[PDB]
Amino acid sequence: SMKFNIIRNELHNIMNTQLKRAESEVAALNRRIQLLEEDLERSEERLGSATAKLSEASQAADESERARKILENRALADEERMDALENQLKEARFLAEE
Amino acid sequence: SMKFNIIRNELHNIMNTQLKRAESEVAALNRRIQLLEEDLERSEERLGSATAKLSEASQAADESERARKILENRALADEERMDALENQLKEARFLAEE
DSSP states (O other): OTHHHHHHHHHHHHHHHHHHHHHHHHHHHHHHHHHHHHHHHHHHHHHHHHHHHHHHHHHHHHHHHHHHHHHHHHHHHHHHHHHHHHHHHHHHHHSOOO | OTHHHHHHHHHHHHHHHHHHHHHHHHHHHHHHHHHHHHHHHHHHHHHHHHHHHHHHHHHHHHHHHHHHHHHHHHHHHHHHHHHHHHHHHHHHHHSOOO
16 A cells, blocks of 8 residues: 555556547547638638639630631731732733623 | 730730639649648548547546545445444443343
8 A cells, every 4th residue: 555555646647648648639630620621611712713713814815816816817818808809800801802 | 016916925925824823723722622631531530540549548547437436435334344343242242131
């Protein structure tokens, strides 16, 4: 006894510290799991926001890109028009023929 | 023209960089959202593991704590037994009375 009292007490004090650390661990994981879920939630909404911001950025570039093409095709047509008017004057100066 | 060509080109190059950055942003959020979900998954399983490790730590302490109480109650009973035997000898030396 008394010697034994000192043991079954420091033993109590180790079993009690390990139980506290084991509570710490569960406590920490619950905090972690919770801030994660919050970052997740915040990221998803920041993603649909960025998604819309990108779809507009790319529909703008698509529509500038097609404007540029539509302009170059009109320049090309203009030169084919000039070619064509020139071939139709050679056709009308030839078609006489009287 | 040509002066204009230099502009509608550096303009193209800015619209194209902003569209790349906007893709970067969506790209980054998708990576983030994904590693989060993985940490979440890893934390939940590390939580049920820690949960079981704590329930055992606490059922051990509960059962050491009740052993200690059961021992102290048996020590107390032993002293009440001695009290009681002493009061029953005074009862039997008195009950004679003959």
